[PDB]
């Protein structure tokens, strides 16, 4: 038998490792470990881009297997379009503060 | 925190262009002079 | 192979402790006996000052410059031969 005596992550993980472990349990991704899935990206159904400030860099892979990524600052306000494919992105600011 | 922006993200000052000229002179000039002074050193031994 | 037992699908740790105590340490215990049997001091061979052996191109940086780091007087001749 195991007489035990080894801590688990549940008991002893701390700091950012613990925050990543507990968010994953609730299916949340505050530390951007997963690729977000696209919407249809129309003006009616824009890609929703979380940020902790009023702007965030978007990279748009316009078509699957494009080697060229298209990069642009997405500002709080009206949806913006990728300058190459026109896909719509909208910033959704929050804070992580708690 | 650390200084940001042009002239501040470097380990040398660019606050005064004449002091900067002196520093760059000593920096690049020391590099270029060193082989001449090692040739001298070796000729002056034997 | 020269192996032949059969996959022991128990606890991982349990199986590897089984191999540690049942195969690995017994092999070490056996090789330890084979070595504390064949380990009697053997007769040192006649010294021949072969020029491809006892190389000295620079003195060693310890001792008198002429003794190797793990010099064994019984079996390691100097370039001029055995000590006594």
């Amino acid at each position: 038998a195991s007489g035990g005596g080894v801590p688990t992550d549940e008991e002893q993980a701390t700091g950012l490792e613990r925050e990543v472990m507990l968010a994953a349990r609730k299916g949340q991704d505050p530390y951007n470990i997963l690729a977000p899935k696209a919407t249809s990206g129309t003006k009616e159904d824009p890609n929703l881009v979380p940020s902790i400030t009023n702007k965030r860099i978007v990279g748009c892979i316009c078509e699957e297997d494009n080697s060229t990524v298209i990069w642009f600052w997405l500002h709080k306000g009206e949806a913006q379009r990728c300058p190459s494919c026109g896909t719509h992105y909208k910033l959704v600011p929050h804070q992580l503060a708690h | 925190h650390y200084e940001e922006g042009p002239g501040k993200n470097i380990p040398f000052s660019v606050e005064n262009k004449w002091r900067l000229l002196a520093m760059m002179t000593l920096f690049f000039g020391s590099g270029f002079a060193a082989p001449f002074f090692i040739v001298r050193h070796q000729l002056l031994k034997k | 192979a020269s192996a032949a037992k059969g996959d022991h699908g128990g606890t991982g740790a349990r199986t590897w402790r089984f191999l540690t105590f049942g195969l690995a340490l017994p092999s070490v215990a056996l090789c330890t006996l084979n070595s504390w049997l064949h380990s009697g001091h053997r007769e040192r061979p006649a010294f021949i000052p072969y020029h491809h052996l006892r190389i000295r191109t620079k003195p060693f940086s310890w001792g008198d410059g002429n003794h190797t780091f793990f010099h064994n007087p019984r079996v390691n001749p100097l370039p001029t031969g055995y000590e006594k």
């Binding site: - | - | 740790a13 540690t20 064949h38 072969y50 491809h52 190389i55 940086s61």
Partner: protein, 259 residues
Amino acid sequence: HQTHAYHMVNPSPWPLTGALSALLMTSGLTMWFHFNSMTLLMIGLTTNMLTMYQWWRDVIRESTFQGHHTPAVQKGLRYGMILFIISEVLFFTGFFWAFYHSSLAPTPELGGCWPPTGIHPLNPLEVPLLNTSVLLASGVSITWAHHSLMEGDRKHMLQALFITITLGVYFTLLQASEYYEAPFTISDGVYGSTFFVATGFHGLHVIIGSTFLIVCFFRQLKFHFTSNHHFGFEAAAWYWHFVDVVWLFLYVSIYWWGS
């Protein structure tokens, strides 16, 4: 506040102290080989040991104590350790190349034969075979230690890891004794050169790997490792298997085929 999982490291003096350690050790070897003095070298070795101690202490502080080792940081350390081991494989490869070059085309100065005239190789069935059994046994015990850790078994992890360390120490003492008893030396031409430098570098790596395992032993005593998070133990196991495989290549190449 970052919203990625990666580790921004506090500004550290240990890269500079490590770089200067390398200057003192190299200029020290130079002073030892040419100017009959060990003083620079001893300072270098001392600052090197202090650098490694404080650097790896801080990595334990960052991980066990501060929680900076997210799965993403851990996956990076996995790559780093694999790439490090690959660079060590290629290092050993140069010594194997030297051995095969010298031994497959023995020159007239040797007698045009391998082993050279005047060389009496060790019996590969004596201490070299014991050394093989010792490092192979240590690969079994460390696998036991690994499985005990993952299964949450403190006492069997500690027993298996202790046994692994003990076999490492035993190999080290057997090899020191073989060095003392060997009737050939490093100055015995290309036979002594290839034998002592290849097995000598292997021996240093056994001492390094044994040291890494002892660090894991004391970290385990102090409950640092969880049943799921123990990269230092995994890195030390990979390094230990590396040391075992290099031994098997040395045993087959130098002790057996080159005898």
